[PDB]
Amino acid sequence: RRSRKLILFIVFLALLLDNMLLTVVVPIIPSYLYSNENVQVGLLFASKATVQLITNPFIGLLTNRIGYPIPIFAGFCIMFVSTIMFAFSSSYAFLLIARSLQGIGSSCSSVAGMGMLASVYTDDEERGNVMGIALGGLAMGVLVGPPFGSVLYEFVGKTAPFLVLAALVLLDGAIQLFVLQPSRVQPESQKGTPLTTLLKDPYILIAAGSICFANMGIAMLEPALPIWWQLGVAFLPASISYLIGTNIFGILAHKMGRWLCALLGMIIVGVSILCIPFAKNIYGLIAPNFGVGFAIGMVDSSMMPIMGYLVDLRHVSVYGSVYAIADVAFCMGYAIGPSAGGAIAKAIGFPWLMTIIGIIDILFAPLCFFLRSPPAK
Numbered sequence: 001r002r003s004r005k006l007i008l009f010i011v012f013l014a015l016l017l018d019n020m021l022l023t024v025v026v027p028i029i030p031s032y033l034y035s036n037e038n039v040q041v042g043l044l045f046a047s048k049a050t051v052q053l054i055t056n057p058f059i060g061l062l063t064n065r066i067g068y069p070i071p072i073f074a075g076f077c078i079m080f081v082s083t084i085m086f087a088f089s090s091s092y093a094f095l096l097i098a099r100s101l102q103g104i105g106s107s108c109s110s111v112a113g114m115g116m117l118a119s120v121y122t123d124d125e126e127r128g129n130v131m132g133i134a135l136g137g138l139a140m141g142v143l144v145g146p147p148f149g150s151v152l153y154e155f156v157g158k159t160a161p162f163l164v165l166a167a168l169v170l171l172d173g174a175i176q177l178f179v180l181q182p183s184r185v186q187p188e189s190q191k192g193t194p195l196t197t198l199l200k201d202p203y204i205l206i207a208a209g210s211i212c213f214a215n216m217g218i219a220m221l222e223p224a225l226p227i228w229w230q231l232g233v234a235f236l237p238a239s240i241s242y243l244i245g246t247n248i249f250g251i252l253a254h255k256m257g258r259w260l261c262a263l264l265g266m267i268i269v270g271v272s273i274l275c276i277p278f279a280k281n282i283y284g285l286i287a288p289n290f291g292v293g294f295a296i297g298m299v300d301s302s303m304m305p306i307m308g309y310l311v312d313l314r315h316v317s318v319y320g321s322v323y324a325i326a327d328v329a330f331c332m333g334y335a336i337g338p339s340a341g342g343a344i345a346k347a348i349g350f351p352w353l354m355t356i357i358g359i360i361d362i363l364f365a366p367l368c369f370f371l372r373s374p375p376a377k
């Protein structure tokens with residue numbers, strides 16, 4: 001009733017449905033907008049990520065205090081509510097409210113799920129493979145969001161995508177209730193490491209910063225696009241590379257040494273974003289997006305297991321707070337990317353900002369090298 005494969009499949013389907021509900025509202029954004037960079041789409045991107053950043057550490061403490069399954073089930077009882085709220089959203093305020101709920105549900109699911117994955121798969125290699133599979137599920141969600149949403153919303157109606165996603169969610173929630181059975185509390189054995197200590201560390205800082213700055217590029221590029229069939233096939237070149245990269249490096253990273261794969265993933269992000277401006281909409285902006293996605297997938301699949309590795313090598317073997325920190329770093333892009341990046345743009349323009357990002361990415365790339373051999377304690 002607790003085989004590792006089942007929990008891995010849980011986290012897979014969790015991140016898949018979460019990101020599908022995330023990106024399925026894209027064909028529904030203009031239908032609430034019209035009724036450079038955008039401000040309203042910026043707020044739609046912001047609110048959820050900001051609430052996720054607000055709620056990640058508190059979830060990382062809740063899991064250590066009552067267990068993982070109850071957080072995961074709270075996530076899957078929230079997402080089912082946010083989906084219905086979406087399905088019954090007319091104005092802008094209700095849209096933002098539903099997005100923030102969805103954000104709390106996401107934060108919950110992602111943090112507690114990565115924590116359970118690191119807690120079950122105790123060994124390394126297998127944990128690398130497992131994190132790769134989970135991020136591949138996330139990628140599959142990002143891929144299957146836009147086209148599914150577009151086709152349904154354009155075929156039968158605008159409520160149907162949200163309601164079908166609600167049904168899929170409910171099925172996922174039932175599966176999870178069968179596999180995990182959170183009907184009883186279960187606190188972890190050891191007292192978790194104080195978050196202040198985990199944050200004072202250099203190495204977790206370096207890994208989290210690498211994730212954050214490898215995500216910031218594609219986080220600032222998207223909410224400022226020529227859009228808002230160019231809407232459904234908008235985010236295909238990014239996700240079709242994210243998946244192919246993560247579900248290949250998750251299994252072939254430890255053999256090379258993550259430190260090398262992380263450095264290469266940051267370099268590739270940099271060289272892709274730097275070349276973004278040399279493009280047009282249909283012909284140009286595709287291939288650089290593919291490079292960006294492949295590289296950020298490499299970086300994510302290389303840096304997600306390291307977090308648990310660092311904690312096992314230098315702290316008490318608990319996985320909640322550290323993966324909450326990793327998720328905070330990953331999602332900080334979409335909170336300070338649209339608004340602050342939008343202001344930087346409207347001051348200087350996007351053909352300049354992307355270069356700046358590329359510079360900071362190429363500078364932060366060799367800083368991963370200090371993830372070669374962290375001295376234990």
Ligand SMILES: COc1cc2c(cc1OC)[C@@H]1CC(=O)[C@@H](CC(C)C)CN1CC2
Pocket residue numbers: 022023024025026044045048049142218222235238239242292293296334
């Ligand atoms: C509708 O809201 C949003 C829309 C989308 C996203 C973010 C938003 O909100 C958080 C994700 C975030 C990711 O994970 C990116 C993965 C890349 C690297 C392949 C891709 N974009 C796609 C669009």
